[model samples]
Structures are given as C-alpha cells and as structure tokens.
Target: NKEVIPPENFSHVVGEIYRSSFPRQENFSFLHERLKLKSILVLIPEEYPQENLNFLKLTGIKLYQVGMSGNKEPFVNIPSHLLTKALEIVLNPANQPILIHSNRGKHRTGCLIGCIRKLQNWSLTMIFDEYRRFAFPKARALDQQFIEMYDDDEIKRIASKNNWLPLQW
Candidate 1:
C-alpha cells in the first residue's frame, strides 16, 4: 500500500473545513480517502498545475477558485466584496468537508480563516496569534487589520440570506 501524504501546512480549521497549501500527487489520496472532501477552495490567480486539475476532474470534487493575491501595502489591496463571496461559499453547508488553500497556505489562507474565527466569536488577539503562528516567518499587519476591521454585518447578512446565521456558531 502507498502512503498518503498531505500537502505542506495542512491543518484542520473547524468542523469540516480544512486548510493546506497546494496539493501534490502524493497528497491527492489524503484529499480523497482521508478528508472525504466534497469541495476545494483555492485562493490565488495563476495557471494551476495540470495534474491537480486532472485529479479534481476525475474525483468529482467541486473547485472554488478565488483569483486574489496576498495582502500587500502599496498597490494591492484585498477587495472586501471578493472576500464576502468567498466567505459566503465557505459558510454554506453544502460545501462541507472543504479545504481552503493558497500557494503556501499562509497569508491569504490565514486572512480568510481569521475572518472565520471572528464569526465564531474568537478574540482579536487570539485570531492574530493564530495568524501569526501560521505565518511564522511573515506575519502581516494589513492582514490582521483586515481581519479586525472586516465587515461582519455584511457577511452575516449573506449568511442569513442563505439561512446560515444561527447554524454558524
């Protein structure tokens, strides 16, 4: 039997939600048999590796691609509207057993996961601590600010629109 290897930075987020870096061939089996994943949400904008695409094509896993980059100072900024929809996709129960990944599963993944933490009533300090831990070598101020200042009411409205509010906590 072959060993199942998870992608680098693999970790459980909450409930059926998972976090990881990009998946490689050796990691596909773990994504399939181990996680029993129903969907995957990727947070980057580049030509994906062909093998990873093929694996999803054959495995019947739904792919949610958010074409966004990491938070940076000068020119780039995360669009609130984009994260709104991305979070919408994450909160919906139909997409359970889902994995969210960025190339390295640090900045972008950490930012989004931080927002999710706030929804779960986590303290800002705790959220930043978790983000900083995951981002070890590269903690980001803008990302932390985004998490702290993100529009909770906006996300909550969508959750209620989809009837996912009370069930969220």
Candidate 2:
C-alpha cells in the first residue's frame, strides 16, 4: 500500500485550501493524489529543490515562492506588497485548493492566515488564539502586531473592487 503523509503541521484552511510546513518527497503522494493541489505558496526564502520542482512539474501543480522574512528585532517584516500578493493568489478562485507553507507553518504562514481570518470577520482574540495554537512554542508578539496593523478591510475592499472577495466555499 502507498503511504500518504501530509507534511508536518498541516492544517485545513477553509475553502479546500491548506497550510503546512515543507512538503518533501514523502508527502508528494498526499499532495498529488490526496489533496490534488492546484498550487502551493512557499513563504520561505530559498531556492526550490530539483526534486520538488520535478514533482510540481509532474503533478502540474503551480508554485508561488515569496521569500518572506519574519518580524524580528532589526525591523525586517513581511513586505506588505508581497503580503497582499499572497492574499491575491489565495483569494483568487483560480488558485483555489492551494496550500500555503512556510518553514514551520508557524510564523510566516500564521501571519498570512491571520490576515485572511481578518477578512473572514474573525475577532482579534479569536485569531491570536489560533495563531498561538499553531505557533505555540514561540509565538512572536510582533507577529500578532503585524496582523493588527494590516488593514484587512482595505485589502478586502481592493479585492472587492475586482469582485474577488466573499469567495464561495
């Protein structure tokens, strides 16, 4: 029997989309057969391995690499433009059934998901709860602050002008 292992820290995001850590060869089967993912959003800052590229080619699943940096003491934060870019792709139906993954599926992914949750009308307490849920061991304060500062309503309206908001499940 074929083994299907989802990458560690996998969580089902609403609308057939998912979030997880890196998906390697072991998880390729799950990505290809089980999830049938159309695209994968990579938030880590690195080059794609040949094997992963090969897998994507064979499965015909697209990849979006945004090379994001985390919020830290020195003042480098995830770029707002890139943040919205990820939002655009995530919100687009064409990229539906997508997976958003960072190195740990914690910080970078958490930040992105937090923004989405804001768009979905989630409360701050509710979101920070989920953020801490996934980023339990080391949930960064600035990470929470990042979402707080981001105006999801504006992002929602921008996408709304394009008629991309209020997505169907």
Candidate 3:
C-alpha cells in the first residue's frame, strides 16, 4: 500500500504531512489547502526562516519546537535521544499521528521512522517499505547505520522492562 501518488491525490496519504526543507510561503499555503494541517513540529537545528514562521502563524498551525540533529558532534550524538523524544510524542494518545521532517526529510526522518518501527515491533522490510513512501530510495541506505545500532540485545532489554513481549516462536 506504500506508493507514490499523483500530487493531486496527496490528501489521501496519512493526512500526516511532512516537508523537509524550510518551506516557502506558497509551500505552506499549498499544504494548508491540501493537507489541512493544524500544527507543526520543527526540529531546532533545522532552522526555519522568519517568513515561514509568519506564514505558519497566518495559517494558524500551532508550532511545537524541539532540538535534535542527526550529525555527530565532538562529545555527543543525540540521534538516539531525538528518537526517544519523538517516541514520547508518538506514544502520547493525544497525538495519534505525527509529521516529522528535516532539511531533506531523508536521513533524519528515515532514522526516526526506523526507530519507531523497531519499538513498535515491526519487521525491517515493513519499515523500509513505509520509508520509501515519504523518503527517497537512498533513504534506506542513509538509515542503515542507525538501524544497525539498534541491536536485538538492547531492544530485548527495553521490551522486558516495558512488558513488551517477543512474538511466540
């Protein structure tokens, strides 16, 4: 069921819209009319220009901002932390669906979705399939490193701690 559509059919997709780069005013306008988005989530280091903020205000989408970039730094790599934060958002019943994007919505977005897929107990193929819907073909390649980082040992530990179960053999 994961596939691209004619741009006109974009409305049927998750109603959960995501855009990577800082959108132009017209871009927001198109999303407003097409997706009817009510709020926005902005990753901090993924800067948005003032004009885009003003446009978002005009469209009345509430903006919630958080910080977490995918790059490696000297002392810290917060990709895992960001995935945790995003999980917090995703798990909250009040937020049934979430829209996430980075400058390209390819690398960071793919990694975050991959994490969600793992935490939710999805098979890798299924997660990769969904990634292709919103991300480029190269997204899986970009996400591979992070996916590999989530080895089964830690996943099992978290599952045990949270009372999540392994499927019956």
Candidate 4:
C-alpha cells in the first residue's frame, strides 16, 4: 500500500511526508559542487535522466546508483536482506552528501533518513519534524509500529556501528 498521503499544494512536488526534503535537495546540490565533485550517488526507483551517465562522466563524477522499486511496496521492501545492502551503501563513509531521490523523494527518502535518525537515537518527533520543514510538511506520518518495521532495526544495528556524525554538520 502507498504509505504517504501527501499534503495539497505540494502534491505537484513529492516528499509531502517530510519537511527535510527541500533542504536535503538543496544540501545535495550545494555539496555536489563544494565537495570537489568527485562522485555522485543517485538513488531512485526508476527513470533517470537520459544523459545522467554521460553528464557524470563529463563532470568527472564517479557514480553509485540504486533504486526503490514496486508501487504498493515500501521502497526496497520493508524487512529483507536487500534493505540491509542498501543501508550499507547509505551509511558508508565514502558516500557523503549522497543524492537520494525517488520519483517524489518522499517515501524512499524518508525511509532512509528515518533509519539514520533511529540509529543516532534521535527523537522521532525531531527527525520527522525536521523533514517536514522542507519537503511534504506532513510526511513521515507513519505510526511508531510502521516506523519500527520500516526502520529495519536489525540492519541498523549492524550499520550504526560505523556511522559517526562529522562534527562539521
């Protein structure tokens, strides 16, 4: 089932479930240039720019790509080994200022960010609130039980061992 019921006005845009959506995109764009433009990571379910590969090469941007598939299902399945793999890439140190996007950048983006917050022991209210600030403004409304399941706690335990927030952020 579709997990996000986006708010109005922003329906044209995605990420209705989280406010942090806007900032994340802005952050990615800023970092994409400020970080020496060494690499780019593109996360989407499907359908990317046709010249995306070539553009990366022209810009000398090495690329890491992943997708969130299926309509009625959560991006990458809720509790599966594949989610663990995706988390590995997301939390990897080399993967900074990652460009995580789905068709709307709501459900998939929220899932990834939510998991990160949980690992950091951040309060759900804070994380979800922050996300709502930029994207959907009504996003990440999934209840605690859904949040818990979507979070993939087992994978987080393994992934969290290596995640250390850079003091700069």
For each candidate, the alpha-carbon lDDT, in order, equals: 0.85, 0.85, 0.55, 0.48
lDDT of 1: 0.85
Candidate 3 lDDT tens digits, 10-120: 212122434444454446545566556566555657667788778768877666566665555653354565666664554343443334556656566666667756765
List runs of model 2 lying over 4 Å from the truth.
70-76
Ranking by TM-score: 2, 1, 3, 4
lDDT tens digits, residues 144-163, model 1? 98888788898987887878
Q: Which residue pairs overlap in candidate 3's backbone?
A: none
State in Å the error of residue 51, model 2: 0.9
TM-scores, each model vs. reference:
0.91, 0.92, 0.62, 0.60
TM-score quality measure for candidate 2: 0.92
Residues 1-169 of candidate 4: C-alpha lDDT, one tens digit per residue: 4233322222211111122222233244343443334544444545556555555666665665555443455623433354556556555656544444445556655555556566566787876664565346445445233446654666655654664332123
lDDT of 2: 0.85
**Per-candidate count of clashing residue pairs (backbone under 3 Å):** 0, 0, 0, 13
Residue 24, model 4: Cα distance from true site in angstroms: 15
TM-score-best of 1 and 4:
1
Give residue 138's error in model 3 in angstroms: 4.9
Q: Name the TM-score of candidate 1.
A: 0.91
